[PDB]
Enzyme design. Structure first.
Site, PDB file in Angstrom:
ATOM      1  N   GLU A 149     -25.359  14.332  -9.980  1.00 44.98           N
ATOM      2  CA  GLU A 149     -26.817  14.395 -10.038  1.00 44.98           C
ATOM      3  C   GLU A 149     -27.406  13.505 -11.139  1.00 44.98           C
TER       4      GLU A 149
ATOM      5  N   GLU B  10      -3.722   1.779 -15.318  1.00 48.50           N
ATOM      6  CA  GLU B  10      -3.267   2.933 -14.559  1.00 48.50           C
ATOM      7  C   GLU B  10      -1.858   3.362 -14.956  1.00 48.50           C
TER       8      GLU B  10
ATOM      9  N   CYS C 215       0.786  -1.235   0.000  1.00 46.17           N
ATOM     10  CA  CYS C 215       0.000   0.000   0.000  1.00 46.17           C
ATOM     11  C   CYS C 215       0.820   1.288   0.000  1.00 46.17           C
TER      12      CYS C 215
ATOM     13  N   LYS D  31       1.157   5.433  -6.168  1.00 45.65           N
ATOM     14  CA  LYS D  31       0.412   5.406  -7.429  1.00 45.65           C
ATOM     15  C   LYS D  31      -0.485   6.653  -7.518  1.00 45.65           C
TER      16      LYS D  31
ATOM     17  N   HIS E 204     -27.210  20.434  -8.179  1.00 44.32           N
ATOM     18  CA  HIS E 204     -26.929  21.086  -9.464  1.00 44.32           C
ATOM     19  C   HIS E 204     -25.998  22.294  -9.322  1.00 44.32           C
TER      20      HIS E 204
ATOM     21  N   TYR F 257      -6.407  -3.525 -14.163  1.00 51.29           N
ATOM     22  CA  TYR F 257      -6.375  -2.135 -13.723  1.00 51.29           C
ATOM     23  C   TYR F 257      -4.976  -1.565 -13.509  1.00 51.29           C
TER      24      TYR F 257
ATOM     25  N   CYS G 141      -0.942   1.650  -3.730  1.00 51.88           N
ATOM     26  CA  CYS G 141      -1.935   2.705  -3.536  1.00 51.88           C
ATOM     27  C   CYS G 141      -1.424   4.138  -3.427  1.00 51.88           C
TER      28      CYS G 141
HETATM   29  C1  LIG Z   1     -25.639  33.795  -8.518  1.00 49.65           C
HETATM   30  C2  LIG Z   1     -26.607  32.635  -8.254  1.00 49.65           C
HETATM   31  C3  LIG Z   1     -26.034  31.343  -8.191  1.00 49.65           C
HETATM   32  C4  LIG Z   1     -26.841  30.174  -7.946  1.00 49.65           C
HETATM   33  N1  LIG Z   1     -26.252  28.907  -7.917  1.00 49.65           N
HETATM   34  C5  LIG Z   1     -27.060  27.752  -7.708  1.00 49.65           C
HETATM   35  C6  LIG Z   1     -26.507  26.435  -7.785  1.00 49.65           C
HETATM   36  O1  LIG Z   1     -25.295  26.208  -8.040  1.00 49.65           O
HETATM   37  N2  LIG Z   1     -27.373  25.344  -7.603  1.00 49.65           N
HETATM   38  C7  LIG Z   1     -28.753  25.495  -7.345  1.00 49.65           C
HETATM   39  O2  LIG Z   1     -29.459  24.463  -7.206  1.00 49.65           O
HETATM   40  N3  LIG Z   1     -29.285  26.750  -7.304  1.00 49.65           N
HETATM   41  C8  LIG Z   1     -28.485  27.828  -7.489  1.00 49.65           C
HETATM   42  N4  LIG Z   1     -29.065  29.142  -7.508  1.00 49.65           N
HETATM   43  C9  LIG Z   1     -30.537  29.216  -7.293  1.00 49.65           C
HETATM   44  C10 LIG Z   1     -31.378  28.825  -8.509  1.00 49.65           C
HETATM   45  O3  LIG Z   1     -30.808  29.525  -9.643  1.00 49.65           O
HETATM   46  C11 LIG Z   1     -32.819  29.233  -8.277  1.00 49.65           C
HETATM   47  O4  LIG Z   1     -33.254  28.520  -7.118  1.00 49.65           O
HETATM   48  C12 LIG Z   1     -33.753  28.842  -9.446  1.00 49.65           C
HETATM   49  O5  LIG Z   1     -33.326  29.496 -10.663  1.00 49.65           O
HETATM   50  C13 LIG Z   1     -35.158  29.299  -9.176  1.00 49.65           C
HETATM   51  O6  LIG Z   1     -36.060  28.902 -10.224  1.00 49.65           O
HETATM   52  P1  LIG Z   1     -37.430  29.725 -10.406  1.00 49.65           P
HETATM   53  O7  LIG Z   1     -38.123  29.009 -11.475  1.00 49.65           O
HETATM   54  O8  LIG Z   1     -38.101  29.778  -9.046  1.00 49.65           O
HETATM   55  O9  LIG Z   1     -37.159  31.227 -10.878  1.00 49.65           O
HETATM   56  P2  LIG Z   1     -36.280  31.985 -12.008  1.00 49.65           P
HETATM   57  O10 LIG Z   1     -35.498  30.949 -12.721  1.00 49.65           O
HETATM   58  O11 LIG Z   1     -35.730  33.243 -11.448  1.00 49.65           O
HETATM   59  O12 LIG Z   1     -37.427  32.257 -13.075  1.00 49.65           O
HETATM   60  C14 LIG Z   1     -38.513  33.194 -12.981  1.00 49.65           C
HETATM   61  C15 LIG Z   1     -38.699  33.772 -14.410  1.00 49.65           C
HETATM   62  O13 LIG Z   1     -39.908  34.566 -14.359  1.00 49.65           O
HETATM   63  C16 LIG Z   1     -39.738  35.758 -15.115  1.00 49.65           C
HETATM   64  N5  LIG Z   1     -40.769  36.679 -14.594  1.00 49.65           N
HETATM   65  C17 LIG Z   1     -40.802  37.345 -13.381  1.00 49.65           C
HETATM   66  N6  LIG Z   1     -41.868  38.098 -13.198  1.00 49.65           N
HETATM   67  C18 LIG Z   1     -42.596  37.934 -14.355  1.00 49.65           C
HETATM   68  C19 LIG Z   1     -43.858  38.454 -14.830  1.00 49.65           C
HETATM   69  N7  LIG Z   1     -44.581  39.294 -14.072  1.00 49.65           N
HETATM   70  N8  LIG Z   1     -44.326  38.087 -16.069  1.00 49.65           N
HETATM   71  C20 LIG Z   1     -43.590  37.213 -16.873  1.00 49.65           C
HETATM   72  N9  LIG Z   1     -42.392  36.675 -16.499  1.00 49.65           N
HETATM   73  C21 LIG Z   1     -41.928  37.063 -15.226  1.00 49.65           C
HETATM   74  C22 LIG Z   1     -38.267  36.100 -14.888  1.00 49.65           C
HETATM   75  O14 LIG Z   1     -37.755  37.118 -15.770  1.00 49.65           O
HETATM   76  C23 LIG Z   1     -37.600  34.731 -14.904  1.00 49.65           C
HETATM   77  O15 LIG Z   1     -37.075  34.348 -16.147  1.00 49.65           O
HETATM   78  C24 LIG Z   1     -28.296  30.331  -7.746  1.00 49.65           C
HETATM   79  C25 LIG Z   1     -28.838  31.645  -7.824  1.00 49.65           C
HETATM   80  C26 LIG Z   1     -28.027  32.817  -8.076  1.00 49.65           C
HETATM   81  C27 LIG Z   1     -28.772  34.142  -8.122  1.00 49.65           C
HETATM   82  C1  LIG Z   2       0.736  -0.765  -8.397  1.00 52.03           C
HETATM   83  C2  LIG Z   2      -0.372  -1.148  -7.427  1.00 52.03           C
HETATM   84  C3  LIG Z   2      -1.430  -0.213  -7.251  1.00 52.03           C
HETATM   85  C4  LIG Z   2      -2.516  -0.496  -6.337  1.00 52.03           C
HETATM   86  N1  LIG Z   2      -3.532   0.443  -6.144  1.00 52.03           N
HETATM   87  C5  LIG Z   2      -4.567   0.177  -5.216  1.00 52.03           C
HETATM   88  C6  LIG Z   2      -5.543   1.171  -4.929  1.00 52.03           C
HETATM   89  O1  LIG Z   2      -5.540   2.301  -5.476  1.00 52.03           O
HETATM   90  N2  LIG Z   2      -6.515   0.860  -3.969  1.00 52.03           N
HETATM   91  C7  LIG Z   2      -6.580  -0.375  -3.286  1.00 52.03           C
HETATM   92  O2  LIG Z   2      -7.481  -0.542  -2.431  1.00 52.03           O
HETATM   93  N3  LIG Z   2      -5.635  -1.322  -3.545  1.00 52.03           N
HETATM   94  C8  LIG Z   2      -4.663  -1.057  -4.458  1.00 52.03           C
HETATM   95  N4  LIG Z   2      -3.619  -2.023  -4.687  1.00 52.03           N
HETATM   96  C9  LIG Z   2      -3.678  -3.293  -3.922  1.00 52.03           C
HETATM   97  C10 LIG Z   2      -3.250  -3.179  -2.467  1.00 52.03           C
HETATM   98  O3  LIG Z   2      -1.987  -2.468  -2.456  1.00 52.03           O
HETATM   99  C11 LIG Z   2      -3.106  -4.576  -1.873  1.00 52.03           C
HETATM  100  O4  LIG Z   2      -4.375  -5.204  -1.979  1.00 52.03           O
HETATM  101  C12 LIG Z   2      -2.738  -4.547  -0.385  1.00 52.03           C
HETATM  102  O5  LIG Z   2      -1.452  -3.880  -0.222  1.00 52.03           O
HETATM  103  C13 LIG Z   2      -2.613  -5.949   0.126  1.00 52.03           C
HETATM  104  O6  LIG Z   2      -2.371  -5.925   1.546  1.00 52.03           O
HETATM  105  P1  LIG Z   2      -1.754  -7.230   2.226  1.00 52.03           P
HETATM  106  O7  LIG Z   2      -1.722  -6.899   3.646  1.00 52.03           O
HETATM  107  O8  LIG Z   2      -2.527  -8.458   1.797  1.00 52.03           O
HETATM  108  O9  LIG Z   2      -0.269  -7.403   1.736  1.00 52.03           O
HETATM  109  P2  LIG Z   2       1.034  -6.456   1.577  1.00 52.03           P
HETATM  110  O10 LIG Z   2       0.690  -5.061   1.924  1.00 52.03           O
HETATM  111  O11 LIG Z   2       1.712  -6.819   0.328  1.00 52.03           O
HETATM  112  O12 LIG Z   2       1.850  -6.900   2.868  1.00 52.03           O
HETATM  113  C14 LIG Z   2       2.447  -8.192   3.050  1.00 52.03           C
HETATM  114  C15 LIG Z   2       3.723  -7.897   3.865  1.00 52.03           C
HETATM  115  O13 LIG Z   2       4.229  -9.176   4.310  1.00 52.03           O
HETATM  116  C16 LIG Z   2       5.659  -9.149   4.253  1.00 52.03           C
HETATM  117  N5  LIG Z   2       6.063 -10.562   4.232  1.00 52.03           N
HETATM  118  C17 LIG Z   2       5.899 -11.504   3.231  1.00 52.03           C
HETATM  119  N6  LIG Z   2       6.364 -12.703   3.532  1.00 52.03           N
HETATM  120  C18 LIG Z   2       6.871 -12.553   4.806  1.00 52.03           C
HETATM  121  C19 LIG Z   2       7.517 -13.440   5.740  1.00 52.03           C
HETATM  122  N7  LIG Z   2       7.731 -14.723   5.428  1.00 52.03           N
HETATM  123  N8  LIG Z   2       7.916 -12.975   6.963  1.00 52.03           N
HETATM  124  C20 LIG Z   2       7.703 -11.641   7.317  1.00 52.03           C
HETATM  125  N9  LIG Z   2       7.098 -10.732   6.499  1.00 52.03           N
HETATM  126  C21 LIG Z   2       6.694 -11.236   5.246  1.00 52.03           C
HETATM  127  C22 LIG Z   2       5.953  -8.294   3.030  1.00 52.03           C
HETATM  128  O14 LIG Z   2       7.312  -7.837   2.975  1.00 52.03           O
HETATM  129  C23 LIG Z   2       4.871  -7.227   3.084  1.00 52.03           C
HETATM  130  O15 LIG Z   2       5.255  -6.037   3.724  1.00 52.03           O
HETATM  131  C24 LIG Z   2      -2.524  -1.777  -5.597  1.00 52.03           C
HETATM  132  C25 LIG Z   2      -1.446  -2.670  -5.805  1.00 52.03           C
HETATM  133  C26 LIG Z   2      -0.362  -2.394  -6.701  1.00 52.03           C
HETATM  134  C27 LIG Z   2       0.694  -3.475  -6.778  1.00 52.03           C
HETATM  135  C1  LIG Z   3      -2.662   1.425   3.125  1.00 50.73           C
HETATM  136  C2  LIG Z   3      -1.754   2.140   4.156  1.00 50.73           C
HETATM  137  C3  LIG Z   3      -0.827   1.500   5.147  1.00 50.73           C
HETATM  138  C4  LIG Z   3      -0.660   0.006   5.273  1.00 50.73           C
HETATM  139  C5  LIG Z   3      -1.684  -0.300   6.474  1.00 50.73           C
HETATM  140  C6  LIG Z   3      -2.713  -0.933   7.260  1.00 50.73           C
HETATM  141  C7  LIG Z   3      -2.335  -0.285   8.446  1.00 50.73           C
HETATM  142  C8  LIG Z   3      -3.631  -0.483   9.179  1.00 50.73           C
HETATM  143  C9  LIG Z   3      -3.811  -0.262  10.605  1.00 50.73           C
HETATM  144  O1  LIG Z   3      -3.171   0.143  11.396  1.00 50.73           O
HETATM  145  O2  LIG Z   3      -5.029  -0.669  10.928  1.00 50.73           O
HETATM  146  C10 LIG Z   3       0.089   2.357   6.202  1.00 50.73           C
HETATM  147  O3  LIG Z   3       0.869   1.790   7.035  1.00 50.73           O
HETATM  148  C11 LIG Z   3      -0.027   3.939   6.163  1.00 50.73           C
HETATM  149  C12 LIG Z   3       0.767   4.806   7.089  1.00 50.73           C
HETATM  150  C13 LIG Z   3       0.636   6.307   7.025  1.00 50.73           C
HETATM  151  C14 LIG Z   3      -0.297   6.969   6.023  1.00 50.73           C
HETATM  152  C15 LIG Z   3      -1.110   6.143   5.077  1.00 50.73           C
HETATM  153  C16 LIG Z   3      -1.008   4.637   5.111  1.00 50.73           C
HETATM  154  C17 LIG Z   3      -1.878   3.761   4.097  1.00 50.73           C
HETATM  155  O4  LIG Z   3      -2.639   4.317   3.278  1.00 50.73           O
END
Ligand SMILES: Cc1cc2nc3c(=O)[nH]c(=O)nc-3n(C[C@H](O)[C@H](O)[C@H](O)COP(=O)(O)OP(=O)(O)OC[C@H]3O[C@@H](n4cnc5c(N)ncnc54)[C@H](O)[C@@H]3O)c2cc1C
Ligand SMILES: Cc1cc2nc3c(=O)[nH]c(=O)nc-3n(C[C@H](O)[C@H](O)[C@H](O)COP(=O)(O)OP(=O)(O)OC[C@H]3O[C@@H](n4cnc5c(N)ncnc54)[C@H](O)[C@@H]3O)c2cc1C
Ligand SMILES: *CC1=C(CCCCCC(=O)O)C(=O)c2ccccc2C1=O
Ligand SMILES: *CC1=C(CCCCCC(=O)O)C(=O)c2ccccc2C1=O
Lengths: 461, 461
Positions: A455, A184, A41, A49, A450, A180, A46
């Protein structure tokens, strides 16, 4: 021989998680580690990577800078710079953590552990014996490389382990694999400037994922500049004056086989699978069961076929993720030291994110798996595709695809699959809902946020 | 006189949404618009705001470009460039939508609408009278501006409407207000280069949000370079040779009040609230109920006090969000044309995201609201704060704070509050879970996705 309540072999995700929970419950435990605490890991998985993925994303940002009203940036990436910062971050994690093992009063045993032939559960490290009524095997795995006999020159290539040792950006890279990790790595190398090719055995990557994801991911790789070499396999590798020459055979269905020589390759990365670390544990001395791949066999409670011995994590070959190893380890600790006989990990509905470009998020069953379990007659899928608002002003584009798989009359959500901007942080909450058995009605009755990409999942038509 | 089956006053989110579906249900509706079709959402709200936020976010991340191994990139933003692309994007949206409008056959009446006497619901537009058995009022609202009698020179400042007409980046900006619109505008202007100040009446922004969010957001604004002028109010505004002079009074508790003259201000933006558009509707001629603020009063089914007349959206003053206006509008066209006594928008647990830097996500009750509804003895909160790993290699930093509010013995999750990178796309899924009545156990039982910020919400302790 020193006696403990709990002996954990392997100081990685699974081992450390189990050892620390056991200790919190009062258990006297010790962890055996032969290398760096933290395991895969933190050291070669992990964490590092993700740092490289964040870097690759920054490259994508550089490209849209002009489109967003700013003067264009140069673009000369310096791999050495991030490499040094990434290593420093890993060092901090390793330090800050080792402290935790100390605070939990867990003994750390440095060295390679192996089971002894002693009738009682006992292991040996270096030359000393250790025993306990409970022993956990959490040794993880390692990258798979071809045998010299199968593909001559295979040793000239590196794996994900070598990827993290790189100190410079390879000019030309060829990644072999469709999983995978292969995806990757190819994505990161290509985004940072390497002329990248991804060689796969069939027509698409991530074939175990939902069909929509497999198809979409393959297309996004190609759109990003990654050359996907389909129905291709490496036959041989040889050193040349500029680097490596990769001999490839392409066998597309309906066509004749063709051999191609890929020249001037700087980095050949094998990402063809993982192999468990069980070879030298002397499992036979106790009759510990494994499959023909070396994976330790366990039941739903992580029990091996031998009383007092368990296994969790990558070594078992199921759901190879860090959070899974951690959860399995903790659930086991509660079962053994809190006496909760029903404590175990539910392997159903485990979510996963693939850090591709854009990222992928999936939880539950693929459409095909749902069809097989409930019957095509009882499966209904909803899906959508769109271009995220972020690209409203950019020349470069990526799409977002989402799929919801529902089952039975009440349209229970049994699967969620998606790829697109933000999908990496979008999945966790939906995973909780799926685990709760949400139906499409539950999704639709939740007011949308949104404007976001998220969504779209609660407004599917 | 012109007669229809459904008359809608206002061409915004609530108006078009209800009318469009009305037409779908086989209804015969028409919509009156005095300005630009679409409403606040597409012209001076949601959409254009998000494009500007994306632009601001871009600028902020690029300050970390050198830390990520790339050559430093200059930052002379060109406002005119984005303004033009933003306008074009909105144009493409209106066109695409316009195609769906004319498709459903909906008569659009241009001009300002106003009610008349008549023993039956009747309205007049430009002399011509129109009527129908069902009349929907969805006139939305508008930005509030101080009266000259209260603050001389107040007309010298603009509002969010004028913000979207800006064609150049103001050199010096002063935003007055502490609500989300004020926070979003200040963040965008400051991120893009304007020397920005945010004037608030008290000590923190977003005081209606959970205390953790109010505190954290105020701190992040200051860290981003926005000068937060606390316990301050505008007394007068004057035109000068170099822009505007803003006379301000600051009265911090424990200190003596002081007058300050802010010179060389290029843009003074009033973001002190919005008022409903009902001043010229002559609803008094029909006895339509309104509050002292001018909001149209309605019941759970959006019914006014006069049979045959309804209202939805901002004009009602509750949950001023686009998805709420759209949903309420659809649920209404539903009831009046589907006959489902239980058809109505549920206003509980509506999620919201504030596009600050980093973004804020919230759903459910604040800690204080929960404490009052359930009792301090029946409320338990879980929270965490950390630095996202995106900043592991950057000099610039932002933090992530998350809070889970639980109620009763089962620890039902009644509130989720957070601010941090990715929180904008992270909230939707968790909102679905809260709407389902999820408990903390449901969250903890869901396996984490590593490495992400979202996994922290399912591993709170
Ligand atoms: C800067 C900004 C950022 C926002 N970001 C988000 C966001 O990221 N996510 C999110 O979910 N919401 C966001 N909102 C809120 C979201 O845009 C509003 O909740 C949503 O548009 C409301 O829909 P509505 O139909 O109630 O009114 P509106 O869409 O305002 O529509 C009412 C319409 O009626 C018209 N109208 C008004 N009076 C009359 C009339 N007397 N006769 C005819 N037409 C009329 C208007 O001109 C308008 O076109 C944001 C709002 C602002 C201001
Ligand atoms: C390139 C790569 C990318 C990966 N990316 C991901 C990811 O993004 N997310 C994810 O969830 N998993 C990922 N994995 C998988 C994940 O790393 C493994 O599933 C996980 O490390 C396995 O844990 P383990 O405890 O079974 O073994 P390991 O962590 O391999 O540990 C076994 C340990 O035992 C020791 N050991 C072995 N034999 C003996 C012995 N006889 N005596 C004493 N010590 C011994 C070893 O030296 C080692 O430290 C990836 C693996 C690789 C190879
Ligand atoms: C994946 C990971 C490991 C290997 C560990 C499992 C250790 C679990 C435990 O104690 O229950 C690490 O040893 C380690 C250490 C510091 C920061 C991140 C990580 C890991 O992501
Ligand atoms: C918020 C928004 C609007 C305002 C409208 C209600 C449209 C509702 C419906 O008929 O069901 C748009 O008109 C619009 C048009 C194209 C693309 C995006 C949007 C919006 O986000």
């Amino acid at each position: 021989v020193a006696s403990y309540d709990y002996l954990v072999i392997g100081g990685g995700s699974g081992g450390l998680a189990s050892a620390r929970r056991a200790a919190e419950l009062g258990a006297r435990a010790a962890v055996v580690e032969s290398h760096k605490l933290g395991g895969t890991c933190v050291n070669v998985g992990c964490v590092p990577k993700k740092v490289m993925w964040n870097t690759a994303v920054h490259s994508e940002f550089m490209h849209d800078h002009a489109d967003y009203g700013f003067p264009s940036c140069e673009g000369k990436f310096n791999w050495r710079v991030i490499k040094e910062k990434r290593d420093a971050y890993v060092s901090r994690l390793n330090a800050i953590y080792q402290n935790n093992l100390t605070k939990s009063h867990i003994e750390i045993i440095r060295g390679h552990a192996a089971f002894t032939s002693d009738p009682k559960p006992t292991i040996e490290v270096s030359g000393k014996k250790y025993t306990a009524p409970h022993i956990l095997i959490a040794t993880g795995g390692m990258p798979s490389t071809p045998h010299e006999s199968q593909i001559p020159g295979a040793s000239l290539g590196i794996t994900s382990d070598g990827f993290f040792q790189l100190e410079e950006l390879p000019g030309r890279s060829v990644i072999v694999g469709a999983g995978y990790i292969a995806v990757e790595m190819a994505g990161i190398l290509s985004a940072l400037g390497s002329k990248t090719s991804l060689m796969i055995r069939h027509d698409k990557v991530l074939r175990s994922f939902d069909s929509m994801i497999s198809t979409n991911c393959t297309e996004e790789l190609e759109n990003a500049g990654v050359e996907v070499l389909k129905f291709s396999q490496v036959k041989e590798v040889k050193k040349t004056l500029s680097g490596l020459e990769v001999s490839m055979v392409t066998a597309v269905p309906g066509r004749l086989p063709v051999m191609t020589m890929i020249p001037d390759v700087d980095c050949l990365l094998w990402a063809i699978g993982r192999v468990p670390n069980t070879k030298d544990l002397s499992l036979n001395k106790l009759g510990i069961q494994t499959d023909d791949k070396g994976h330790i066999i366990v039941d739903e409670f992580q029990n091996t076929n031998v009383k007092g011995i368990y296994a969790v994590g990558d070594v078992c070959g199921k759901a190879l993720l860090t959070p899974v190893a951690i959860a399995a380890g903790r659930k086991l600790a509660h079962r053994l030291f809190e006496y909760k006989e029903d404590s175990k990990l539910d392997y159903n509905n485990i979510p996963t994110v693939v850090f591709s470009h854009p990222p992928i998020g999936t939880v539950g069953l693929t459409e095909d798996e749902a069809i097989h379990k409930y019957g095509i007659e009882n499966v209904k899928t909803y899906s959508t595709s769109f271009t995220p608002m972020y690209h409203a002003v950019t020349k470069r584009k990526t799409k977002c695809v989402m799929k919801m798989v529902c089952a039975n009359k009440e349209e229970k959500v049994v699967g969620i699959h998606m790829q697109g901007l933000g999908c990496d942080e979008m999945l966790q909450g939906f995973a909780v809902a799926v685990k709760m058995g949400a139906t499409k009605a539950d999704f639709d009755n939740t007011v949308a946020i949104h404007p976001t990409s998220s969504e779209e999942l609660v407004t599917l038509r």
